[PDB]
Design a protein around this ligand. Structure first.
Ligand SMILES: Oc1c(Cl)cc(Cl)cc1-c1[nH]c(Br)c(Br)c1Br
Ligand SMILES: Oc1c(Cl)cc(Cl)cc1-c1[nH]c(Br)c(Br)c1Br
Ligand SMILES: [K+]
Ligand SMILES: [K+]
Ligand SMILES: [K+]
Ligand SMILES: [K+]
Ligand SMILES: [K+]
Ligand SMILES: [K+]
Ligand SMILES: [K+]
Ligand SMILES: [K+]
Ligand SMILES: [K+]
Ligand SMILES: [K+]
Ligand SMILES: [K+]
Ligand SMILES: [K+]
Ligand SMILES: [K+]
Ligand SMILES: [K+]
Lengths: 213, 213
């Protein structure tokens, strides 16, 4: 549906403001989402200090711009952003702003899969040789995917996830997130290797090389 | 033990000959192994065209230099190299020549662990969020390590591995290697993130940055 998706853009906690070809890293996905007709609003989660970076483009973008205060951990920032979404939003699209080069086609794909399944995340096959290791440092002998963002979830599903975690006192890590505790399926939408997270100066050189084709 | 280890250096199949600060990538680990008193010999697996690259330093290095012809797949190249090792070698040290920056201290560690356990491999905790995905593209809900080289194995163990694979007609992939079929334990020696494999031009820039501290 048109104007059905609310983006929560994680830009709080800086790496995501270091420019890439003269535009702060955070603005790349911001603009990518803003041009998509499916996207109704972008809730930016950032320190108030950096609000003007997004605010300047508010009149030029075809989305509603909203803000939310960052929390202690990533999941707290998501919860904060969630409190700001349109009451009739059909899909929440959570995105790490340190991921500038997400392609429109791949956002479309994960939105569509999220709509279909209830929860979906962009992923790529893990290129490295990865093995399970037990507590004695031995290989556990017996397909693996690297997760990216967007992570797309229906709001009612996300709300119930937060409810279950707080009422039971469950532990949330980056690996064991809200969805890991739910019995609802999570689809992995096949993305592109170009959707790297930019943290080290080595990544900026790679990101420049990708934007230059 | 001194002069107990035989290195099989995989340089066949080029990325491993592109210079890093003016020295061909393959020579970095070659020299690293050559200076270690534990190392008796290096069996280089490469196309005869590139033999002179290593041969030039033969009189300057404190190891025996030997050569072997590369095979179809990685495991065939290992088998070829294995046929060349000293009959009294106590440890086989298999190394991807596309890994120039392996530290001496980490080679020492994996040699020691290989000697103790029978098989050991350098590994680092996987930094990415990695998940198991089933055939329907759904996350399988429930520690993961990225494997590097050296991969260190007692020769009698490796020989038996090759025997089991050929006599049964087992399938060998990079993930499901010789050791995966054996009941003998494989230890993961904790390495350094700097032990990257150099294949893309982006890696060369990172490798230069690492050698420059
Ligand atoms: O880890 C996730 C994955 Cl793999 C897929 C989806 Cl759809 C959502 C999450 C997630 N991440 C965070 Br932080 C929260 Br809150 C949630 Br829900
Ligand atoms: O994959 C491995 C690991 Cl994880 C540990 C060790 Cl010690 C050896 C191997 C290996 N790799 C290849 Br190719 C051969 Br042949 C063997 Br044996
Ligand atoms: K829009
Ligand atoms: K509105
Ligand atoms: K971005
Ligand atoms: K992408
Ligand atoms: K469908
Ligand atoms: K990206
Ligand atoms: K990185
Ligand atoms: K030596
Ligand atoms: K000898
Ligand atoms: K090397
Ligand atoms: K190392
Ligand atoms: K020991
Ligand atoms: K390396
Ligand atoms: K690479």
């Amino acid at each position: 549906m048109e104007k059905s998706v609310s983006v929560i853009l994680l830009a709080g906690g800086p790496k995501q403001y270091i420019p890439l070809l003269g535009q702060p890293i955070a603005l790349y996905s911001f603009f990518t989402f803003s041009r998509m007709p499916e996207v109704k609003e972008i809730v930016v989660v950032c320190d108030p200090f950096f609000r003007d970076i997004f605010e300047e483009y508010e009149e030029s973008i075809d989305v509603d711009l909203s803000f939310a205060i960052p929390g202690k951990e990533r999941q707290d920032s998501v919860y904060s952003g969630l409190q700001e979404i349109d009451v009739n939003s059909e899909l929440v699209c959570i995105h790490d702003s340190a991921r500038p080069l997400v392609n429109t086609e791949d956002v479309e794909k994960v939105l569509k899969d999220g709509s279909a399944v209830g929860a979906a995340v962009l992923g790529v096959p893990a290129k490295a040789t990865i093995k399970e290791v037990n507590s004695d440092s031995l290989v556990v002998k017996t397909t693996l995917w690297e997760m990216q963002t967007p992570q797309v979830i229906k709001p009612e599903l996300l709300k119930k996830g937060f409810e279950l975690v707080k009422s039971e006192g469950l532990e949330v890590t980056d690996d064991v997130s809200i969805v890991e505790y739910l019995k609802h399926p999570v689809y992995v939408s096949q993305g592109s290797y170009t959707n790297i997270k930019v943290t080290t100066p080595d990544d900026l050189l790679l990101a420049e090389r990708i934007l230059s084709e």
